Design a protein around this ligand. Structure first.
Ligand SMILES: Cc1cc2nc3c(=O)[nH]c(=O)nc-3n(C[C@H](O)[C@H](O)[C@H](O)COP(=O)(O)O)c2cc1C
Length: 377
């Protein structure tokens, strides 16, 4: 067998995966701009073609109405959304695959020209507002043209600092409802909490974006920075069962100028803090997409977390295989390689050559660079 450790089944929460080749969450922007409804026609084909994966983690999907970071990403808050997702999940299950939905709040990376143009009036006190841990806008980065309202690069806006009461009673229940919608109604096998990549939860977790001076979510200690990640995940687990809940973090990922001054101590503490939750897994970016911050995230997690360990970032089959054989990680999620290879698992199984990804077409909103990468045959 080509990569015996990587191709071996894995117990994950209440499931047994067929293999340890995980499909990473990948925003591809194939939902409607109006109601963030999945465009079933394309998304069903896309995911069903990739259902040989050990597990699919579906793309970041909104929990708060209209709070869009990506212009055309899907939501999981409305009945319309749930109905299209249910059809997508049924098709993966028909192929025998497993699918978790990633749940996101874009925080300070929300698109100002979309969010700020729903009127500021009640029925929803969170609507019409940019929200984050602190009033610290993303600096010296522009909203990419493929996410921007216009279709041309835009400036991130200045967010409002969430009150302790809005976090506990405004943000957390949206994740809970989003997760119940995902699992109980659309039939998802699980949900992944989006604690990474500069979004709401990561922004509370790392020092650079959390300067709150007081309360349970303060920026002033490692434990209080961990608390929003904790409280969201815990409330979700209570409603849906911990065996159907994953968490993603990226303690070294410098997107949007995110940085913590002690990522090793932060990560290790997070691990001990979420241990009693008995999650289905912890999924982490082992590094920086920019290649600047360094640290062996794999070893930090291995030393302080005893549940399922899913790593990610510039893996190939051989590295994944050998990190699993050495006991460093339990599974590996692949991003770009799944974009380019719907039959990635088959290619591992016969060591077949791999299609090359084309980043230039990652976000077309059409079939081009989305559903046109062929299987090997
Ligand atoms: C087009 C694109 C969309 C992505 N969308 C998401 C997302 O929605 N949520 C998430 O946690 N990470 C997302 N990522 C990060 C990937 O999940 C993955 O961590 C990244 O591609 C690095 O993995 P790789 O080296 O295997 O591609 C995305 C990456 C790309 C290139």
């Amino acid at each position: 067998a080509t990569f015996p450790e990587l191709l071996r089944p894995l117990k994950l929460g209440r499931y047994t995966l067929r293999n340890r080749i995980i499909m990473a969450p990948l925003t591809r922007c194939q939902a409607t701009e109006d109601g963030h409804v999945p465009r079933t026609e394309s998304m069903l084909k896309y995911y069903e073609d990739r259902a040989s994966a050990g597990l699919i983690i579906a793309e970041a999907t909104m929990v708060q109405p209209n709070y869009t970071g990506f212009l055309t990403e899907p939501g999981i808050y409305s009945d319309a959304q749930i109905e299209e997702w249910r059809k997508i999940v049924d098709a993966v299950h028909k192929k025998g695959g497993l699918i978790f939905l990633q749940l996101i709040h874009a925080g300070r990376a929300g698109i100002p020209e979309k969010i700020l143009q729903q009127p500021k009036s009640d029925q929803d006190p969170l609507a019409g507002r940019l929200l984050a841990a602190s009033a610290i806008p993303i600096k010296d980065h522009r909203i990419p043209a493929y996410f921007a309202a216009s279709g041309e690069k835009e400036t991130y806006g200045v967010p409002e600092e969430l009150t302790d009461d809005e976090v506990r009673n405004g943000i957390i229940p949206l994740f809970v409802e989003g997760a119940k919608n995902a699992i109980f109604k659309a039939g998802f096998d699980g949900v992944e909490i989006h604690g990474a990549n500069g979004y709401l939860l990561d922004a509370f977790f790392r020092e650079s974006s959390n300067k709150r001076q007081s309360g349970p979510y303060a920026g002033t200690t490692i434990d209080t920075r961990c608390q929003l990640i904790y409280d969201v995940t815990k409330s979700v687990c209570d409603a849906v069962g911990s065996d159907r809940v994953g968490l993603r973090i990226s303690p070294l990922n410098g997107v949007h100028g995110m940085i913590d001054s002690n990522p090793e101590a932060l990560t290790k503490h997070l691990c001990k803090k979420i241990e009693p939750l008995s999650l289905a897994y912890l999924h982490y970016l082992r590094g920086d997409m920019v290649n600047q911050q360094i640290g062996d995230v794999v070893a930090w997690v291995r030393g302080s977390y005893s549940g399922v360990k899913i790593s990610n970032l510039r893996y190939d089959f051989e590295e994944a295989d050998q990190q699993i054989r050495e006991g460093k990680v339990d599974a590996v999620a692949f991003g770009a390689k799944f974009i380019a290879n719907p039959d990635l698992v088959e290619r591992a199984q016969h060591d077949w050559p791999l299609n090359e990804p084309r980043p230039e077409t990652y976000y077309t909103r059409t079939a081009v660079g989305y559903n046109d990468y062929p299987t090997y045959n």
